[PDB]
Design an enzyme around this catalytic site. Structure first.
Site: not given
Ligand SMILES: [K+]
Ligand SMILES: [K+]
Ligand SMILES: [K+]
Ligand SMILES: [K+]
Length: 262
Positions: A44, A47, A104, A140, A211
């Site tokens: 992440s 992002k 996240s 994702e 993570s």
């Molecule tokens: K995430």
């Protein structure tokens, strides 16, 4: 090798994993690196690149951030804390940007990727601000596979620290945009046990964690101590076992070693 590098190497050895650190001191523009040119899965932390790309777009589409965006049931993926609160409703690109950065939210990230035209649209913004290393290949949640040796969805600590500097302290963005990004990073909810936990409690921090599989545990931060120029710190960590547990303590300890090396 430096004194700091000796201590980071020892931390890595005690951890059983692979550690990557890049510090940029904006006082003398000096850098501390540990495996600064190795590739790590971003998870992440990517992002930040996608939110910044959308901010760059908003500089010409001045009402882009208030544009509503449908959240449909099929848009939901594996981790959707904020977006699952709006299924069959709408969220603005500002609301999606903040959900991606501060919680996240993986459905939020996918909406930002869509707005940019696919993962190639994120990578393109990286190339446009001088980052030839970053690469986003998947959406994702598959970008989190963190497979050892896979170059997909990686960057290096040095490249990400340079980039994070430009977006947050440089002028890769416009000034309204940069401060929106800084505010967003300062309001992150996911980082208390990562870089923030290793730093003097008086320092101001904005960060983005990540993570993934292989116990991948990441944090990228911009740091404002009192009285001195700000710093950028990137800490990436990944492990040999596909099912390994998160090790946010490694990132806090890396930050402590770096802060005490100033
Ligand atoms: K995430
Ligand atoms: K080695
Ligand atoms: K990888
Ligand atoms: K994990």
């Amino acid at each position: 090798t430096s004194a700091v590098q000796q201590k980071l190497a020892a931390l890595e050895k005690s951890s059983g994993g692979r550690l990557g650190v890049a510090l940029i001191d904006t006082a003398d523009n000096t850098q501390v690196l540990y495996r600064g040119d190795e590739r790590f899965p971003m998870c992440s932390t990517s992002k930040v690149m996608a939110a910044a790309a959308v901010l760059k777009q908003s500089e010409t589409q001045k009402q882009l951030l208030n544009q509503p965006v449908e959240i449909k049931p099929a848009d939901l993926v594996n981790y959707n804390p904020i977006a699952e609160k709006h299924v069959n409703g709408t969220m603005t690109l500002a609301e999606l940007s903040a959900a991606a950065l501060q919680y996240s939210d993986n459905t939020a990230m996918n909406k930002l990727i869509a707005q940019l035209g696919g993962p190639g649209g994120v990578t393109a913004f990286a190339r446009a601000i001088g980052d030839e290393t970053f690469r986003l290949d998947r959406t994702e949640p598959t970008l989190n596979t963190a497979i050892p040796g896979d170059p997909r969805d990686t960057t290096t600590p040095r490249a990400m620290a340079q980039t994070l500097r430009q977006l947050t302290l440089g002028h890769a963005l416009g000034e309204t945009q940069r401060a929106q990004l800084v505010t967003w990073l300062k309001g992150n909810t996911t980082g208390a046990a990562s870089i923030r936990a290793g730093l003097p409690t008086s320092w101001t921090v904005g960060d983005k964690t990540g993570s993934g599989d292989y116990g991948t545990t990441n944090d990228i931060a911009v740091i404002w101590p009192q009285g001195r120029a700000p710093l950028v710190l990137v800490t990436y960590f990944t492990q040999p076992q596909q099912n390994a547990e998160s090790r946010r303590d490694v990132l806090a300890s890396a930050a402590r070693i770096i802060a005490e090396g100033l």
